[PDB]
């Protein structure tokens, strides 16, 4: 929507305009691309900090936020499930969520497509994430692969383990997906497990 | 009957919970001597899992009653079930060695059938006795180890077939060989190797792997609890 | 093998959940032509209940898959042939138990409590037969079921207390037959209301050994009416 | 104990002695027999009334209750289940208990051994009761019935009504269990539809 696109350039301007033309066919409107871009840039830090804290957003922050929300509308299915990785140091939103149960990050969920994140060092938490409501944003800014999920996106903790290094290794799946998601038809049955 | 007609009969027998029929259909598909599809393999396994499983439960039941004054037919009955069980195992083991294991092309499939070979040799050794027992137990350990070696070299530590093997082989060590030491060793390793490389998880079978990893974790915490000790208290 | 050995084998089979074996043992005990005890009767019934029951479930499953398919090809053709295989098995089980009833069980029955049980049983398996039967053969089984049930129902009415679990059990099964088989919700709800009302009217007749049996069946009768009745309302005050 | 036996006589007290024809080797002590007797006589009405409402018991009522509660702790579960009958006019404690659930009458539960009670007229509630913790007070000084203790929890196995008003129940003493009124594999052997 232009009202948002204009309001965006009025506050960030040069930084906002920068991201226009960074998509092959372009499913997202000029306003949405800019908000996602501005997030991926440097605003992700302060914006999520504000959402998580429950703090009252800036004009430009509310702008980026509704710009993202708009793009996160219809982008659910997205027929395929995607594997992404996220690391945290000194606190994770999902530490509050016990295994089998659901919870969410009050900020937007940034997860990289690169498995390097899962094998990165000196982390607090390392989590492999499965979901489809995410938005592929990488290539846009400022380097060269990452999927980002909506604020307050409820996730089920499928597995948690505090390894021989104090690091929590988790498996997160998007709550929506179901109970039959992640299972290869009757292979568990065919494996004749002891249990 | 054509291969397709058989597979369809098998699927219907599964639904109808006519496992003897299901086993019969899939045995015939296997006996056509062709590289079974993963769906075909699964059908065969699920069928025989249920045919042998029934006899295992009856055995355990009758064997439990044997513990608790003309219990001559109790023994006879256990022995009737014992006979059935062996014939089932010898049916699936012939299928494995003659068709399934040689026809396996991809290591994923070879590991499955070798896991299977140790599984049914374990079922055999549960009712076997004397020198015959020490053979089955060894045949089990050989099949399970052969698969374990192929899995460690060709599959990711999160693979459901690799993890499934880990659980079953670990259970074999605990239950059959009576080595809680080797059982926990296998399970801790397999679990730890999988959590270390959680990025290797497949988007099609991730909840399969996590589930098995949970069963490994559960077994480990149970088994270590059964093997405590002494001393300063 | 001795009668006692066979009953032990049947009791073992039951525990092992090897019903085919359980039925085999009890068939042989019955075939010894001597009046079954209540324990023997129970064993025979529980065994055959489970042997025929398996095929009934298998039938219902396949018949449903066979009527919920768009695959107007081989997949449905398989369904029918398989349904017919189970149909064949089911009939063989029913004839086997019906022969046992008519040849041994019903004539050997001394106490009316036992005679009603075996006649109830005779209706029960004729109803099982009727569920899969077709044409003129179907109309025979349905009427044979009814005859056996009604014959049992008169004796229970004249010889058993309205709270008797065997009388109440017959009540429920005969009422289910009318609903499911004859497709008469009227006659179904008639039998059920009556049987239930008779029993609540004479709750003092309850046996201290089988009272929770009686109450349980009365609950199932009450449930059936309150259901069969909600599915058949026939009213519009907008006249 | 004699402390209660003596207390009962220097109070009620010629009415108390009455129920003592000696025996001499009964299951219940002189004190207990008197208490149960005095209940069965005329004190059942006023005693239960105060128990059900809350009202502090009269010096005499306290002792009857004392003697009664003592006899129940001496007898308790009597291995075989009895069938007894109970009537109500103007409300029943078990009306508050829905089917399958347990509840109790805050007073003592008097039940007659005569099935005439179950087929009696002008009733609010009619209940056939199955228990073991009861006490036969017909074999005691005259006359036929079985008493269950105060606050005895009972499971409502069945309830129905009517053409019109009177509700009929099946009560089983909570303690008895789950396997209590079932004849070994009969239900299974009846191959019911459900």
Residue numbers in the entry:
A (entry chain G): 234 to 377, 380 to 430
B (entry chain B): 3 to 70, 76 to 240
C (entry chain A): 3 to 241
D (entry chain E): 234 to 376, 380 to 430
Task: Pull text from the paper.
Two of these, exotoxins-S and -T (ExoS; ExoT), are homologous enzymes consisting of an N-terminal GTPase-activating protein (GAP) domain (73% identity; 81% similarity) and a C-terminal ADP-ribosyltransferase (ART) domain (78% identity; 87% similarity). The ADP-ribosyltransferase activity of ExoS and ExoT and their cellular toxicity are dependent upon association of the ART domains with 14-3-3 proteins.
For both exotoxins, ion exchange chromatography (IEC) on heparin sepharose, as well as consecutive size exclusion chromatography (SEC) coupled to right-angle light scattering (SEC-RALS), indicated the formation of protein complexes of various constitutions. A complex with an apparent molecular weight of roughly 95 kDa (heterotetramer; expected molecular weight 104206 Da) yielded crystals of space group P21212 that diffracted to 3.24 Å. This site involves the C-terminal α-helices-8 and -9 of 14-3-3β, and can be sub-divided into two parts: (i) The two proteins bury a common hydrophobic core made up of side chains originating from the 14-3-3β C-terminal helices and the central β-sheet of ExoS/T (primarily strands β4, β7, and β8). In all our protein complex structures, the phosphoprotein-binding site of the exotoxin bound 14-3-3β protomer was occupied by an amphipathic peptide containing the LDLA-box in a short α-helical segment (ExoS residues 420QGLLDALDLAS430) in which the D427 side chain hydrogen bonded with the 14-3-3β Y127 and Y130 side chains, and the hydrophobic side chains formed hydrophobic interactions within the amphipathic groove of 14-3-3β. Both positioning and interaction pattern were virtually identical in previous crystal structures of ExoS-derived peptides in complex with 14-3-3 proteins. We concluded that LDLA-box 2 binding to the second 14-3-3 protomer was an intriguing observation with possible implications for ExoS regulation.
